[PDB]
């Protein structure tokens, strides 16, 4: 028994269904065999101790889920997933990780196996902090996040949550994996959009930290304030509404 929640109920059927649905919503990925995807996903963690998972265990899945996204249309995020996804629902040429096949399959799910049987553990799974870091879920997200960040080019945008105690958190997935795998030259600029929950939050100490990290990788940094995120989304969808324009 572990400290974290058990595998999501009907995990096999959920992955299969998500794969089929993805290939329906995204016709460009209809060449994938969803049964093969599931077999590869399961192969990464079944009959294995869930504190000894490696990026290599997920390689077969990564190969099968290969997806070349337009490298200049990537939206990263940290602690504000819902808004980033709402944005790509209205700005449909842009992609977050969870708009790719592999990210879509796993988003909000939990899974693990055990060393001595081919059973999925529905009772409990390792918590990153309390139990162990190299667990099936954490290793999956580390692997796919690294690869997605590696593939980005030109200007990369990131939404950050302006209401958090740390707007930029070096211990977040964004701060510990994604930001350190943006490639210089390939990526010219990282532009942060700080989402308000009316000061200029681009002067926040943690934003100055992010700027330093990025500049040390020889990438330019830009920061913007999104003062009204829901209104922002409305105006992305329909910019011709008069509430999209400042009063004279």
């Amino acid at each position: 028994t572990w400290s974290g929640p058990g595998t999501t109920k009907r995990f096999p059927e959920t992955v299969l269904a998500r794969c089929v649905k993805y290939t329906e919503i995204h016709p460009e990925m209809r060449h994938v065999d969803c049964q093969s995807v599931w077999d590869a996903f399961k192969g990464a963690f079944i009959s294995k101790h869930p504190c000894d998972i490696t990026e290599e265990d997920y390689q077969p899945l990564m190969k099968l889920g290969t997806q070349t996204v337009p490298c200049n249309k990537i939206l990263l995020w940290s602690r504000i997933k819902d808004l980033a996804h709402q944005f790509t629902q209205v700005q449909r040429d842009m992609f977050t990780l969870e708009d790719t096949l592999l990210g879509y399959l796993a988003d909000d799910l939990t899974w693990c196996g055990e060393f001595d049987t081919s059973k999925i553990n529905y009772q409990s799974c390792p918590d990153w902090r309390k139990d162990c870091s190299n667990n099936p879920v954490s290793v999956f997200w580390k692997t796919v996040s690294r690869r997605f960040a590696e593939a980005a080019c030109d200007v990369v945008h990131v939404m950050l949550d302006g209401s958090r105690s740390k707007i930029f958190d070096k211990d977040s997935t964004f701060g510990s994996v994604e930001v350190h795998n943006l490639q210089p030259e390939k990526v010219q600029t990282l532009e942060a959009w700080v989402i308000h929950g009316s000061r200029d939050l681009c002067q926040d100490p943690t934003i100055k930290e992010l700027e330093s990290i990025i500049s040390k990788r020889n990438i330019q940094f830009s920061c913007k304030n999104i003062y009204r995120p829901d209104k922002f989304l409305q105006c992305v969808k329909n910019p011709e509404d008069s509430s999209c324009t400042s009063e004279i």
Partner: nanobody
């Protein structure tokens, strides 16, 4: 990110056309505007334009100025006709959106009407 041009000196009654190139995704998604600042005065918004080209003007320039837009870069242009000494100012282009900041500013372009 913001580069303005087309200013100069003209006689009262004359015309100038200002241009601004704005580089960035947020400019492409936002309503844009032309602002101006007279030497000892507050910066004022004088003209706005939606992504699709719907315009609005301050009463003091209505009928004399025309704002246009071409669309990640947006170019925003301000045609200024029948110029008055009161139009003397530094002109700036930026976002004019309640959703997104007019965070940073270009150098502006100086207009002097004698």
């Amino acid at each position: 990110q913001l580069q303005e041009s087309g200013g100069g000196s003209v006689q009262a009654g004359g015309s100038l056309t200002l241009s601004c190139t704005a580089s960035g995704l947020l400019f492409r998604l936002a309503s844009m505007g032309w602002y101006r600042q007279a030497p000892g005065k507050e910066r004022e918004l004088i003209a706005t334009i939606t992504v699709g080209g719907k315009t609005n003007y301050k009463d003091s320039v209505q009928g004399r100025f025309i704002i246009t837009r071409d669309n990640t870069k947006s170019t925003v242009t301000l045609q200024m006709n029948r110029l008055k000494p009161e139009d003397t100012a530094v002109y700036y282009c930026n976002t004019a959106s309640p959703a997104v900041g007019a965070d940073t500013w270009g150098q502006g372009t100086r207009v002097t009407v004698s």
